[PDB]
Amino acid sequence: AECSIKVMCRFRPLNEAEILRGDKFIPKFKGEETVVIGQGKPYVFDRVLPPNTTQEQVYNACAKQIVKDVLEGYNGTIFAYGQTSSGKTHTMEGKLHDPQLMGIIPRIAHDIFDHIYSMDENLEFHIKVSYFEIYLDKIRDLLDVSKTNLAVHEDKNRVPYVKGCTERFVSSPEEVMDVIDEGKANRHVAVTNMNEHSSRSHSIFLINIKQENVETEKKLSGKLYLVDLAGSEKKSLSALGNVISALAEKTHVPYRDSKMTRILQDSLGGNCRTTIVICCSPSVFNEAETKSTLMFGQRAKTIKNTVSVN
Numbered sequence: 001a002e003c004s005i006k007v008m009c010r011f012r013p014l015n016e017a018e019i020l021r022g023d024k025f026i027p028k029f030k031g032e033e034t035v036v037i038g039q040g041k042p043y044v045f046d047r048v049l050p051p052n053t054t055q056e057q058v059y060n061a062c063a064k065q066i067v068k069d070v071l072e073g074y075n076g077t078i079f080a081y082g083q084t085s086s087g088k089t090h091t092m093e094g095k096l097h098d099p100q101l102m103g104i105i106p107r108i109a110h111d112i113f114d115h116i117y118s119m120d121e122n123l124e125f126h127i128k129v130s131y132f133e134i135y136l137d138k139i140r141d142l143l144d145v146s147k148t149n150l151a152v153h154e155d156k157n158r159v160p161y162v163k164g165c166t167e168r169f170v171s172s173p174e175e176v177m178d179v180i181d182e183g184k185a186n187r188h189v190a191v192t193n194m195n196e197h198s199s200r201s202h203s204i205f206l207i208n209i210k211q212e213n214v215e216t217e218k219k220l221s222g223k224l225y226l227v228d229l230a231g232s233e234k235k236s237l238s239a240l241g242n243v244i245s246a247l248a249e250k251t252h253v254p255y256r257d258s259k260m261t262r263i264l265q266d267s268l269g270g271n272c273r274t275t276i277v278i279c280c281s282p283s284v285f286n287e288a289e290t291k292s293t294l295m296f297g298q299r300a301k302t303i304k305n306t307v308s309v310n
Contacts (some may be wrong), residue, residue, distance in 0.1 A: 004304045005268075006046045006275040007297040008062050009035060011282050013051035025282045026061040026290070035294075039238050043294045045301065046275075051282070052080040057092050057126045059107045066224070067174035068113045069115065069273050070209050074221040077267035079207050079227035080277045081240075083289040083298060084199060087279035092228040096180065103182065107206055112209065117188050119182065123213030128167045129176055131183045133203040134260055137236065142183035142203070152259055160262050167208070175188065180205070189242065202260065207290040221310065225264060232296070233289055236260045243268060249305040271307040275299055 005101045011027055026051070028036035032045040047061050066076040072288045080088040116125050131142040132150075141147040143166040150164045170176045183203075190197055195224025205226040212219040229237070239258030247268060267274045278297040280290055 001308070002304060003273065005243060005300050006164070007278065007292065007301045008047045008049060008275065009043070009045050009278050009280060009297055010049040010058060010091055011035075011280045012050055012085075012090075014283050015085075016222075018285060019183075019283075023283045023285060026287060027282055029245075030155075035279055037290060039293075045297060055091070055101065055103060055107075058091060058277075059104055059243075062277055063104045064111065066273055066275060067108055067115070070207075070222040070224045071112070071115055071211075073222060074307050075222045075224065075266065075272040076225065077173075077225040077264055077268075077272060077274045078277065079229055080227070081229050081232060082279035082293055083233040083286065084231035085282070086281050088228055089198075090184050091157065091277055091279060092226065093180075095140070096177070106173070106177060108224075108226065109176040109209070112207070113173045119137050122215045123211050126169075126210040127171070128161075128169050128210075130167045130206040130207045130208070131179060131204070132162065132165060132166045133187070133201050134236065135197070135201045137258060139259065142186055143168060144177065144204055145186045145189055152262055159266055162259075162263065165206075183286055198230065201230045202227060202236070203261070204228075223266060227264065229299075244296075244300055245301060248299045249302075254264050268303065268305075270305065272305055273307055274305060 026037055029048055029050055030036060033046060033048055033244055034042055035048050036042045049058055049061060063078060066078050070076045072141060078091045082088050090103060090157055092103050093105050095101035119218065133140055133142055139149060139150045141160060150162055152160045153163045168179050170179065206222040209224060210221040236258040239261045242257065243253055243255055243261045253269060255261045266272045276297060278293050280293055
């Protein structure tokens with residue numbers, strides 16, 4: 001199909017420190033896709049999502065489609081890039097069990113299933129999730145703490161994948177939920193210590209959705225990544241950063257710079273529908289990063305992917 005990588009920009013509101021430290025709101029929103037910082041040039045994306053916009057609405061805006069797609073046969077990835085404290089974890093997962101405050105992952109959980117349940121008796125679906133976080137170029141099963149430093153490979157079709165990953169099976173959004181809760185717990189067994197730990201730790205949630213209609217025996221499938229990157233502020237980022245920057249404009253892409261990269265390789269260069277949610281801060285306290293981030297999203301919006309079924 002050859003469709004572009006969508007990019008959305010979500011701005012948190014101002015925090016206490018900022019609110020109390022006076023500060024002020026930098027971004028100016030014109031149209032429903034363009035943002036403006038102070039005097040400078042105007043940044044334009046697939047959608048811009050100010051503070052006031054709900055998570056529900058954030059969802060319909062970025063995830064909702066990616067989900068219908070995976071169920072059609074294509075792969076999908078939706079990650080959140082941005083400097084620490086910007087909103088990534090709130091937008092990717094949110095308050096897990098609040099029907100209002102819950103982020104994307106859980107909502108996708110519900111959407112996937114709401115969708116399946118409704119389909120015909122034929123074509124059964126095999127959904128298996130896996131969960132793991134990266135830290136210093138090396139992996140770590142979130143569902144099996146014992147294991148750390150697992151590694152990647154190229155399938156039959158010769159494309160990469162984390163191997164030896166504890167793939168759990170789910171039949172309802174609830175399971176998917178439990179599974180996430182497991183991880184977040186299995187994490188809490190860790191000393192360096194949490195807030196710190198994350199900070200530079202990207203967590204990956206994989207949802208491998210496979211279906212076959214039994215009657216016609218025609219199959220389908222797709223991997224749907226829900227990455228929540230760690231801070232971007234000034235090492236895999238750089239890997240990432242280049243891996244795309246080498247995509248804006250015959251060049252050769254250094255996927256191999258980092259596993260991560262090596263992982264979402266098909267999400268940046270492969271038959272895969274991809275969206276990016278860049279989270280930003282409105283306080284001038286970070287006007288810098290704001291430029292790099294935006295700039296980062298900007299570059300991405302250019303990169304076009306070729307995506308096919310099966």
